[PDB]
Design a protein around this ligand. Sequence first.
Ligand SMILES: Nc1ccn([C@@H]2O[C@H](COP(=O)(O)OP(=O)(O)OP(=O)(O)O)[C@@H](O)[C@H]2O)c(=O)n1
Ligand SMILES: [Mn+2]
Ligand SMILES: [Mn+2]
Length: 330
Amino acid sequence: MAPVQKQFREFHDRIKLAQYDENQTLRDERDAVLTAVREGLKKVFADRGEAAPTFTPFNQGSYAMNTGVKPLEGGEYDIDVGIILNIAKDDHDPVEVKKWIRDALKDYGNGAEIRRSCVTVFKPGYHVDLAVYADPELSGGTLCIAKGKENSGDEHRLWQISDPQGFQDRIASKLSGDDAAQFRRCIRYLKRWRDFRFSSDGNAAPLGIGLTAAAYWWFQVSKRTDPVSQNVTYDDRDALEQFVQTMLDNFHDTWDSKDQRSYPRLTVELPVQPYNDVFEKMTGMQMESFKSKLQALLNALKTAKSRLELHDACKALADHFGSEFPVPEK
Ligand SMILES: Nc1ccn([C@@H]2O[C@H](COP(=O)(O)OP(=O)(O)OP(=O)(O)O)[C@@H](O)[C@H]2O)c(=O)n1
Ligand SMILES: [Mn+2]
Ligand SMILES: [Mn+2]
């Protein structure tokens, strides 16, 4: 066994959250919101003189991709779902259409908010992010998401080409079997690191989709095949070291004319439509802090290879992964 592998696998077992297909609670919470939308849409379309448009829901996000983590105490579950409205995008304003969904959910939980890229509804200990799409078959064969806020300019409210099922396929398909299992474990490790070390400043935290897209570009398996048994062992500490170092290598000093200084920026393009940099909203100063903390994590991963005393190696890692990283007693 690779150094600290037992402790990484135990850490994974503590942080992992069962995916939608294995998680009745999440399916029930998802479905309760989809039912509230269907009921709520009846009221909204009561004064329009026609039936509410129908929609086709689909699972999105980490709970669809088997990369979900449990929140830390006081954190929330992030239930991501897509709804494809039986509407032509050319007939409707994208913020108009998100208002249907917001109004439908007005009285559900702690209420609902139009965000740039979804309508979010709040419950105790979880939120549900509904991504709202027009029907491809009515919208020129394209799947487009409703972008813009109520307080957005005409240029910022748009139906944007989006490929959530292609992204989910690219994550599922990069690797297979226990190689793909290591890939998903390493995405989860970085999400717990994110939640433990980016808790001061929420909006500074690297988005889950960005960490996932970074792993899609740059993750490499680390494993060994025993020359006698051909038994395979994985080295999650090494896989994370190489991945973290590769991320650090892709930061680029980027001049900002407004501030008259450079900030180190990591660009991570989605590998499907709309091919945007998913880290674009992070400020330069937040990027600088992200790089510094990633470098500190790299240095701890290297320390965990050298310590020899298992307690010391694991303590170095728990300083970046938090209190659920197992630290054996010396
Ligand atoms: N090609 C695209 C474009 C956008 N998204 C959006 O990305 C959302 C998920 O983003 P986020 O919640 O940050 O990522 P997760 O992988 O769910 O990470 P976490 O576990 O941290 O929530 C999805 O619901 C979807 O709307 C996507 O999945 N695929
Ligand atoms: Mn999510
Ligand atoms: Mn979300």
